[PDB]
Ligand binder design. Sequence first.
Ligand SMILES: CCCCCCCCCCCCCCCCCC(=O)OC[C@H](COP(=O)([O-])OCC[N+](C)(C)C)OC(=O)CCCCCCCCCCCCCCCCC
Lengths: 153, 51, 49, 50, 101, 95, 42, 221, 77, 130, 199, 159, 102, 105, 110, 60
Amino acid sequence: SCTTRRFIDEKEKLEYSRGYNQQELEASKLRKDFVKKYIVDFDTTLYKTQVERDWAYIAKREYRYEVQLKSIGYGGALANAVLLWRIYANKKMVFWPIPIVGALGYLYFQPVFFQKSNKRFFDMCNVGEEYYLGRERNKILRECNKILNVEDF
Amino acid sequence: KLLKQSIYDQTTQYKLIKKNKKRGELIPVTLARRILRTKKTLVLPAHVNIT
Amino acid sequence: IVLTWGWSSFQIGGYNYERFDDNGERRNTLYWKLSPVEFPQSKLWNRPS
Amino acid sequence: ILKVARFRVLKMRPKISTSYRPHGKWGDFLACIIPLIWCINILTNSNLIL
Amino acid sequence: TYYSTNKEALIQNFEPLNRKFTEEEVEQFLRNEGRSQEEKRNWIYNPHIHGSTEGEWKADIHEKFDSGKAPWEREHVKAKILETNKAKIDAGEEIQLKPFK
Amino acid sequence: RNRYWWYRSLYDDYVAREAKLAFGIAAFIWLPHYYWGIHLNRAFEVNFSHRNYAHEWGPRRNRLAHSLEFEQFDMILENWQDLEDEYAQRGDGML
Amino acid sequence: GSCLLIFIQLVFSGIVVLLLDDMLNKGYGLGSGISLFIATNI
Amino acid sequence: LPADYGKMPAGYNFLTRGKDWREYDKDFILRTDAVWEKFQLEHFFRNYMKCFFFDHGLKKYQMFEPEDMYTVVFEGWALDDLITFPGFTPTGRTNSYQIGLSPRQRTVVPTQTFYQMQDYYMLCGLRFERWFRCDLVYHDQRHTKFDQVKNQKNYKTYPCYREYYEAQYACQDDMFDFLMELAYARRAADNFESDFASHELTTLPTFYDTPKAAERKTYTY
Amino acid sequence: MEVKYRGPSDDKLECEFLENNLLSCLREKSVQDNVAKMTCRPEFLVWFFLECPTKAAVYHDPKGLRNIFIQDKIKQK
Amino acid sequence: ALFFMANTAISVPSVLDTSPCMKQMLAYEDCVLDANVPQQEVIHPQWPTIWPRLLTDGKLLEFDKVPFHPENIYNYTYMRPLTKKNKQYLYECEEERFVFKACLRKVISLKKTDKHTSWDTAEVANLQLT
Amino acid sequence: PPFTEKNINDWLYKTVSITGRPIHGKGMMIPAKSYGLHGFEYLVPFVTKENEDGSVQEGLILNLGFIPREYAPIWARARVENVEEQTFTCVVTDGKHLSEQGGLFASNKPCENQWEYADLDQLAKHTGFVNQEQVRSCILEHVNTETPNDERDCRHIDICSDYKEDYPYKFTRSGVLQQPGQMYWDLNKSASYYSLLGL
Amino acid sequence: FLFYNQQHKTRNGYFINHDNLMLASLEERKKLIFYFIANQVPEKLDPVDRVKFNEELSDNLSTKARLIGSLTGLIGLVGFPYISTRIYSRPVLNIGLSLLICPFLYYVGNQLTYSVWEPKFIANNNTVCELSKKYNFTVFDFAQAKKEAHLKALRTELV
Amino acid sequence: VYCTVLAYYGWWLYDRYYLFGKNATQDIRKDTTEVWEKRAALNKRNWGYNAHYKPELERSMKKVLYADPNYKFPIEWPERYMAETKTLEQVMDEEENWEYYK
Amino acid sequence: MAQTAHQNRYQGGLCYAQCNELFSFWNPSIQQCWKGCDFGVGRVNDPEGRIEAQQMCKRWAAELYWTYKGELDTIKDLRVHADMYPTTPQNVYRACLAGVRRQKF
Amino acid sequence: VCGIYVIHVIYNYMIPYYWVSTPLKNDEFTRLRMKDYIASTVLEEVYGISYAEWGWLPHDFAYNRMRGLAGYMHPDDPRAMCTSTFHRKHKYIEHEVEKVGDYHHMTYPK
Amino acid sequence: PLKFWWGLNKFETIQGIHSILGNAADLVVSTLSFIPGVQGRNNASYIENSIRVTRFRGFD
Ligand SMILES: CCCCCCCCCCCCCCCCCC(=O)OC[C@H](COP(=O)([O-])OCC[N+](C)(C)C)OC(=O)CCCCCCCCCCCCCCCCC
């Protein structure tokens, strides 16, 4: 729902604002590695069952809009700022700040937006213990529960 | 959702709602029914066919 | 007046309504998978009809 | 609109319309393609809901 | 779309045999010359070369040849597969019974 | 195509300059409408998915809750029957 | 034809080869179009 | 496996008392959110099947007919027609099932005779006429050989039940009342339609009007 | 459906009614309904576990259930 | 018409059913349907305890019923005890009934504890976002 | 109540459970934002003692929690508010960040329900209670004590993601501890940014 | 051709077929079949045997081939500036020349060290003989492994 | 040629509608018996008949019972949707005198 | 043909053509005949598949109309004529059986 | 176009109205069915479902498929004949149905 | 990319070049077989000859 999505977004913003501890950082690293590999580094249409393919593609689309597109937008904003600076300095149109600074901004902001929304992507893979993706996510979840001394879903 | 015993005067509550009830510009049709009120409801099932 | 306002105002309005007002949802509902969706704005108010 | 609002008044480049009568190449055919599409659309939608 | 669908089906549903063919499977392969194509073979029972009894031998022959059931679908063959390759069973590798086609 | 044929097809009147200039602007004014329509179509699809789930799995979950409550009663009943057996042994010493 | 004999030289049967042979022909043709498309652009 | 596998043992009480339930843990899978989902189940039930309210004065569950939000909220003090809640089912079982369309019923007078018309008035007249013919045959035997017998030993369904229900379905009660007035006027005088019918002498011939009506039909497997 | 949320009531009178129904059902079903007149209503049993979590937890606890059984036996003489 | 909607959201999948013991419930219900038993109380796996009279005489109500008079066969279905055929074809569904009851008991044994830090955001794990 | 202008430091930010009757008719809506929603903190005059005629009343100010902007008007709600005696578990709080949120070029309009910041004296005057000093002393924030006591919980109002609770949404024990925008991590980030800008 | 990658065709015993087995002795047939299966379809072996065979192959054929190719590529980098003068430098041209020469020399050296040492490794290795005796593959196993290897190569080309 | 193409399309529609039997007979003879048998096998569907319980549980008794070729269901599938035509006393008597196979 | 398997009657093949030839053009029995063609696709040639298809026809007739247990087992004449309309489960069953009979392959 | 439409209407709607005006002794229901069929059943209906994807999303298509199978359950309906089947998958993507004729009930698509 | 000289192996001239280099290296090894640790080349073994002569056989 819109309320659920807004609550998730704002809670993630608050969590990123306050900090991320040490064991929380370790659990976040495990979750990010699993999500990155099994979603970004894999073709989600290659899973055996239809449930796995559908929900892995949903998670990948969420990653695309919340990390890839957001990081592209923020890197483009940084590139636009540098581009305006260089146009004002040189008193002429320049093209170098677009590619280089855009790539630097993307590389700066992709880890930030991935760390912010790691739990969101990790939980969206909870298709169940009957499937390979769900089994792998549950293994990583049990490791994270051991690290954080809590129980998650 | 409990049919409790009222400590008020139900006639007075009815007459105060009738006389002067708070309203506003953006008031929903659910809470503002003046011409759409009846004493009976036609109850039908859902997801099925009625002639 | 002719082009920019008549082709972007309603989209901006719907985006702001979803972004800020949560599409006017009555939040006291139990199960999202069993609840109807409060649709974003779909009737254009910048067209005469 | 822009043209007729900027370059068709007498003080802004009017035109000497020297044509007695129009000679057209399939006029209505171009003016009826846009409405016909609409008709199609409407018809289809109605049928589905019917 | 035929190429895309076939590629997806191959990628999703292809795994190596992951096991060595058992003795029973190899013996069945060597005896598959006894299978007859387009016409059923007349199985005649000779107790001095086949052993057992006529009913049991004919039941085994029907299971092996006429029914079309593969060697990897036999319970004792499956047990032998799961026993002789228990090292691969450990460390989380699942044995594939029927070779891919 | 044929420039002369297409330059006087519309009732012998020439609007080809405005038609040519229309494509460039019209190539971008439809983007907000298209993206918000994508959003609306996805919302409609999600609502239809919810309608299907509620129509199909709506009744089933209520039966599952009913059976959960009946199973709780069954556990309580087993313990109660064990207590009844103990009271049958200890006729009045249990009280 | 030639691919059929080549794939039968590897352990295969005539029926199975045709399914495998078609995929390689489709894949090679797609690469040829990609090479043709690249030539037009540059 | 014994030859009696699947046969219910004698005196099987279907009782699970004192049973080890730790052997079935490998026959089902519960996901990580099973504890959460369980609560949700309860929540939904507690707020979906609870169309009744406990009353402290009566100390029992009561209910009323479906009402609008304005009447429930701003007329909660003024509630009328409160009926004690009887339960969804008499035996306390569950009734929450998805429903569908039951099988149709046989048709004596088809609806397809007049189906291009959404308004069934000619169809209503046709069905009532057919029922009235059947009734004119059986109207005075109803209390001796049919539904209206004194004892159930001689009970038989009235032969015109299906045509009567079809005519009732096709006609509104107003038009049904008009047709019943006509039926009384024609049954008081015992006016069978065959006593007056002659229009078949002024109707065009058809293949269906052959003298050998039984031999006109070709039967084929 | 737009079902709103309301937590378990835990109302005193409602839970007393539900607990009386639960005790009647336990006494009836513990003897396979061999009573002369059975007043148990199974459906209300469901509601006992939906609106009286405290009493349900008491009934699940073996010592609480033993106390309840002893008091019920004393009441029934 | 052909592309009037200009887009179709095929990405959003069917709502995944994440109920605790739904699969076992459906299996048990299919098995009971196979038995072809007139009594509907058998739908609940707890019927031998909730309605024990189904095994003795079938009197499940103390004449406090409203199903109309016993004029046709389709009356007093719950007032009809299980016959030998019904009992046999219900015993054939004993293992699935036991698995369903075990799943229900295990779900009942699950309690909300203080280590469930993800309770307020359990919708994401429940896969409600499409 | 033991709360007073002189003893408030003893009871400041301390959990009590007080019984009294809230007045939803004269509720103040202090503007506030919670999880991206522009809503209102729902202050009500909480009547503890009153005479039979009701002319003379004394009480406190009770923060019922966050209520969204859509449902702030009484006519916008599908409920008739309960104004009888109820028991509320609230943290006694000074009401500081609410009184320091108006900012420049902002002011409250009383004699109507227009608020920008929680001006304690103006709220007390609006209540009409006789014990003006005690009302001005503090406000009682409706809290849920079954929640973690750390300020890092990141769930400040007692809700779930689906918002299945009923408005107004009461605070968690982390919500009371939470000063919006002035927590120590935010100030540390600001200090780091300004040090970088200066150097 | 350029479209596909063919570095696996003439390496790691991929070229072994039934003609290599028809004329071989029983022991030699077993060794050849085991070598082909281990190089192409390692899944047929236990993980410990896979590790042992990988270790025995790497220090003899795989890593030795990598090192020989690296040395031969270094031979082609006597002068990295190549074309270079004070007036003009050619960084892109020199990089292109390196990318045209060094991979070629790497390929030549790798193919050479596979053409020399692979037959001796197959015929004169104790680990290969011991594991072949341990597994004792048959002709049917070799046929299945040939099918699996071709299908895996096809899948890799597809992905 | 536009008129000719329109006329050909109209004639094709007319022939398809009016010579359906002849066209289908000609189409049925364009393939041999084996091809048509393969196509029929590919299009074989149950359509919802005899869709009884299929045991997925490994310990299910009905799994072994259904594997038994001599298993008798309580009622034939087409009879599961037919109203009973005998009295309740007769039904109960027949069920109480019923005996299980095997 | 809302209850059948094909979008248009021409995809049904020779069986649908024979079903059309069996009844008059206004007779709705043709559709039921078409369902017979659907039930005996891979079953007509198999000796038990034919019995299975006939059972499928019986189940289909029982599902469309209310039927009694013996009603479809005591039909004296299973032959059909042009003016046989699906007004009864017996007529539905007869049309479905006639469609099954006309399913080559 | 308008004249062709009017002639088509008068051919099957106006004139056939006068064919039967009195009760008929022989095959009255047959003759009435003939008159009604040449009027009630029109061609367009088939297209109305043959291209149902032009406004029905996948899930809406599944729900309307079950709804149409329910609503056209009655066998004695010539309009159900000459109407494209509901036993079909959505052209874009199909979620509920895995195979065309794999059901658990004959008159229900699941 | 970098790996296409491997695809160049289909030409018989490249195969001949590889054969010449391999035979020359075999001669070098055989002349250096007196040093311990190097196996050398044996011409009486079927496996070695079969691997040498069938490396490019059936190339596609
Ligand atoms: C069928 C044809 C229909 C239209 C035909 C023409 C008739 C109507 C003409 C309307 C003209 C515009 C009237 C509104 C003007 C304000 C826009 C507005 O509020 O839109 C609401 C929209 C939507 O606002 P919103 O976000 O509040 O949306 C409503 C939200 N709900 C519904 C949920 C409450 O606002 C905007 O679009 C704001 C952004 C655009 C602001 C543009 C300002 C600059 C204007 C530049 C003028 C031209 C350059 C001048 C240069 C001078 C140099 C010296």
